[PDB]
Write a structure and sequence with these properties.
The structure is a homodimer of 436-residue chains. Chain A is 39% helix and 24% strand. Chain A contains 16 helices and 16 strands. Chain A is globular and about 65 Å long. The N and C termini of chain A lie far apart (54 Å). The complex binds 5'-deoxy-5'-methylthioadenosine (MTA) (2 copies) and zinc ion (ZN) (2 copies). One zinc ion is lined by residues 66, 68, 215, 251, 303 of chain B. Chains A, B: Its cofactor is Zn(2+).
Chain lengths: 436, 436
Amino acid sequence: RYEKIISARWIITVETDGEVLENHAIAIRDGKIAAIIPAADAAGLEADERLELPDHVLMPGLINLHGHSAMSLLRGLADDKALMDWLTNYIWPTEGKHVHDDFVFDGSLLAMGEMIRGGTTTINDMYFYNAAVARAGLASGMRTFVGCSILEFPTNYASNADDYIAKGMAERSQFLGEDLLTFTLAPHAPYTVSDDTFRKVVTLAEQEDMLIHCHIHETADEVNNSVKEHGQRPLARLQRLGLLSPRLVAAHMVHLNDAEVELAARHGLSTAHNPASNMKLASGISPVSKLMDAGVAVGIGTDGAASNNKLDMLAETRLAALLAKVGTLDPTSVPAAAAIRMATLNGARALGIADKVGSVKVGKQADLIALDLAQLETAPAFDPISHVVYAAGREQVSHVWVKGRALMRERKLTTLDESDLKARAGDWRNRILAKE
Amino acid sequence: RYEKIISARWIITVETDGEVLENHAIAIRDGKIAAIIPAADAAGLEADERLELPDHVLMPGLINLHGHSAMSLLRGLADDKALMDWLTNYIWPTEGKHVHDDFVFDGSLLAMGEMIRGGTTTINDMYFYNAAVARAGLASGMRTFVGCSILEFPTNYASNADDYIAKGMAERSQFLGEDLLTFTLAPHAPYTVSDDTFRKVVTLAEQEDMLIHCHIHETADEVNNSVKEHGQRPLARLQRLGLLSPRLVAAHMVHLNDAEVELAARHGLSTAHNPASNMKLASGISPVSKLMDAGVAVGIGTDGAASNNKLDMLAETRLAALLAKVGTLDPTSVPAAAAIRMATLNGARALGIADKVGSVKVGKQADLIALDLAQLETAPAFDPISHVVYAAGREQVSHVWVKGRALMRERKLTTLDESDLKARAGDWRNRILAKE
Ligand SMILES: CSC[C@H]1O[C@@H](n2cnc3c(N)ncnc32)[C@H](O)[C@@H]1O
Ligand SMILES: CSC[C@H]1O[C@@H](n2cnc3c(N)ncnc32)[C@H](O)[C@@H]1O
Ligand SMILES: [Zn+2]
Ligand SMILES: [Zn+2]
């Protein structure tokens, strides 16, 4: 028998742009999409659970291709400052004082409860204390990529580049054979990582077959300083070092010339587009249309909650679509179907799992969400694709499944204790503000 | 005795940027803010109703300085098209077929239910069938500015400019003496209104002491075509015609040179900044920082739901703050307090009522909202100003009052039947799509 049969008014498949099935149902077995059939035919099949969702659209879960989940604990602590001031006087001293395993576990859990509430099923994270993020990911049941961050300078976590690498690999080894947990190597950025460290990352990722997750070309300063320090722009340096290949997920990628767009396409890297962070930090506008036109997989991330300050992939997908139009001055840039593909199947492509998740197709894993469109905010309901991108909100996600397992049902979290998350956040408020 | 006493964890006054009162209470009588006092002192005062809101922030209601509320019925009907295509083949034929009193009343009600749900207390609207919008506004209890639209060409409503004017004035006369309902003159835009019609508007608005509400400098085409047709850019033309003065609310104001910023400041007009519409229609980025630095009141509107496609002033305020930073490449542009002021007190200034609404001050009318910040999306709760702008969402508004009267209580609409609104929207879906 099937484990579940979920019927819905609409299903946005993401198999082809614009495809929406009406009054169909998804049958699930072994954690995968077993059949996609007319809801009429579903009524007479055996299932452990049946669920009927009138006025809901079912769609693949959203894939947040770039986060720093534990920074949820720093959400709105300091805003609207010059960047040097914000980092030097607020963020870094706070991290130095507070970031240990406890902070990372609590902050990751808090982020995961927020992400699930908004229909995010996969997170591509990168932070410190990788065992804590992994523990949080297995607790939540999200599809989790834990990014083992690598920096040259000392932090609470590790003392130098070789130490970040060793500790990350050691923690990875405690979590082997977990289907929903994948460790990646995460050299932080070209301006915090030396040539020799990049070489070690290239060698290691090749030996162990790991993804590389790195902030690249976020700011004009980064790109201009690279030339003075390394004699060439960061992408050209990384090409020389062997970093550009299909295993690389390049976050931000804001400042690109046309030669660099072609470079990305030729090496098959993917990018994570982080529009709110790029706007809030005044980084600029990533040329996502150029990138996608060149054949590059452009997914969407939220970045950290201290520069967003939401972890809302629906809002981020809408912002990607809006920012693309104002940046190109073309109202046809990044149409709703394209934005949905960025938020789902492109994230899967970036992560090397597009054969397994990212669209509603038989044989793929059942990473799905349902949104209730019977609200004023999405009335009248003409076309669910348009509404998902331009009108629907995080509050309308009613159900979330990852590999067919319910993580949220009628907005009740099933794997995390929402009260506990609020209490951890409240504790951190007192600890960070020195209130008792 | 007081009519109400509302205590809250935080009160953002908007009297001074950054001012937040902790554990205070608002006492209300005769529809006005009668006292702002420590919550401890409140417990021993007589009140018809007392309300306690732990973990909520109270703040002035949001003022949507530019809407076309009835277009809520066209939300997501057609998206991502070239502008000429969108208007010529989808929006205008649909309006021509469907827009009568019924459409305007139903669509206005639907918009008003969505606006109240998101903490909007005042709407500066402009559409056709002004009596229908007025009837809807009195039904909802929102503070409503009904904009009597004026165009040269015939529509279902009126046949020529003098006809729009006559019919608008006739409908205005049926709604006299209503404290929360104000009619304005709304010549649509420089490219749809003749010199002679602008002159008639100037004369009439002066005789009757009315606001003028007009789309100005939205697109590069508008501004460039003006020179060929009228020999000068639209603002200079409108200055020559007598249109620029403190009674003018100029919507959009995207394409401005520095001389035009100074022109606006010298004539005391206000602007309505509509970031989502300007992005979605690829109009450009209004230089709001320049305008505010020159002393111009810049408020925020959503425009119509067909080019947003939300009527969510929280999301619009956040977008204003984000777009300002990416447009200036300065992360300190439009800080959270400034964005809140744009969404509240600047809207009041534009509408000539800043002595009456827009901030939490004794003697002002009690147009207030409460947001519940005890959600993961706004945890940890460091500073409510930052959260209101960068993290909080429309779903967190729990209570709305206009002139001290509850329009929404624990997210239950008190003046509108939410089921009825959904049903009207559903009816319009069938009518517009030709389904039965
Ligand atoms: C893995 S995301 C980057 C992490 O390293 C921190 N970080 C990045 N650059 C610096 C720097 N120059 N000094 C201190 N901390 C840094 C950031 O605040 C974040 O915690
Ligand atoms: C009062 S907002 C503008 C209204 O007039 C309509 N409109 C504006 N310009 C034109 C035009 N050139 N032809 C037809 N309708 C128009 C818009 O679709 C909207 O309903
Ligand atoms: Zn990042
Ligand atoms: Zn408008």
